[PDB]
């Protein structure tokens, strides 16, 4: 039939820049931390689904007043369109009506795609400033010295 | 006028919206 997507917005999350992110062991662990645990304050829209597409960043929320809008940084949304769930920063908040407040999003690629050991699969790529494991660190110690 | 994307059942015949 028609596909719907579910959102869950957060308050005053420490993540506000691309450079720093909270890496997790695996997607399940990250989801458990963001969804099941009570870390941060959050507005959950489990009951009310939304019609939204990742391609258009614009989003419109029903029951979030202007006062509640202030402080939102992170939004995690999962759509039936794509199995993979997504996370994004709420770059800009705008007021259009007493009943709706628009928010723009920017997909947080690092959290969405780089979880786990996926980056290790890259082949024949220039690397720089990588933290080293103990075996190679001891092996390479004179070079760093 | 503007509508949110929250599956708001709208009936053209009788629906009246309070907000702009």
């Amino acid at each position: 039939d028609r596909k719907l997507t579910h959102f869950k917005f957060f308050y005053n999350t420490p993540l506000t820049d691309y450079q720093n992110t909270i890496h997790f062991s695996s997607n399940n662990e990250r989801d458990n931390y963001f969804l099941n645990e009570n870390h941060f304050n959050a507005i959950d829209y489990k009951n009310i689904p939304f019609n939204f597409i990742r391609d258009r960043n614009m989003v419109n929320l029903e029951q979030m007043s202007w006062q509640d809008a202030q402080g939102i940084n992170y939004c995690t949304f999962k759509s039936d369109f794509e199995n993979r769930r997504y996370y994004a920063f709420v770059n800009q908040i705008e007021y259009v009506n007493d009943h709706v407040t628009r928010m723009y999003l920017v997909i947080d690629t690092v959290m969405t795609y780089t979880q786990g050991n996926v980056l290790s699969t890259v082949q024949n790529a220039f690397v720089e400033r990588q933290h080293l494991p103990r075996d190679v660190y001891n092996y390479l110690l004179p070079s760093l010295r | 006028s503007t509508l949110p994307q929250s599956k708001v059942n709208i009936d053209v015949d009788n629906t009246v919206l309070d907000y702009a």
Binding site: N12, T13, T16, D17, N73, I93 | -
Partner: protein, 49 residues
């Protein structure tokens, strides 16, 4: 300052402006109960608030 931080209950765009402004460097003048607290004898500045 220059880092990743977020003040509670702040509009994200205002947070970005504050971040950049602090990165440029902002000077704070403590109130002295005067018309223009911004202008004072700097040499009198002392350690404790």
């Amino acid at each position: 300052m220059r880092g990743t931080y977020t003040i509670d209950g702040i509009d994200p765009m205002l947070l970005e402006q504050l971040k950049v402004l602090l990165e440029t460097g902002v000077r704070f003048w403590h109130n002295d109960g005067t018309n223009n607290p911004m202008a004072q004898n700097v040499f009198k500045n002392k350690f404790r608030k």
